Amino acid sequence: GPLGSPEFQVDMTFDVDTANNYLIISEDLRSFRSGDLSQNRKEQAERFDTALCVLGTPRFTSGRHYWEVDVGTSQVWDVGVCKESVNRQGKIELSSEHGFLTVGCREGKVFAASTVPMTPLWVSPQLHRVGIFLDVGMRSIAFYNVSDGCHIYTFIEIPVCEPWRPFFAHKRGSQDDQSILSICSVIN
For β-strands 164-171 and 64-70, DSSP reports them as unpaired
Return the half-sphere exposure (C-beta side, CA atoms, 13 A cut-off) of residue 181: 32
CA angle 156, 71, 27 (to 5 degrees): 115
Reference 58, options 188, 179, 168; nearest CA is 168
* Rounded distance between C-alpha atoms, residue 79 and residue 57, angstroms: 14
DSSP one-letter code for 53: E
CATH number at residue 49: 2.60.120.920
Dihedral sign from CA coordinates of 11, 17, 63, 145: positive
Number of domain units in the chain:
1
Give me the domain span that covers residue 48. 1-188
Residue 159, preceding bond cis, omega within 30 degrees? Answer: no
C-alpha pair distances (Å), 105 with each of 77, 112, 123, 126: 5, 6, 10, 13
3-class secondary-structure state, position 28: coil
Q: What order do you get walking across the sheet with 181-183 strand by strand?
A: 23-25, 31-34, 181-183, 64-70, 129-135, 140-145, 150-155
Displacement of CA 105 from its chain's centroid (Å):
11
CA distance 168 to 181: 8
Give resolution in angstroms: 2.5
Largest CA distance in the chain: 44
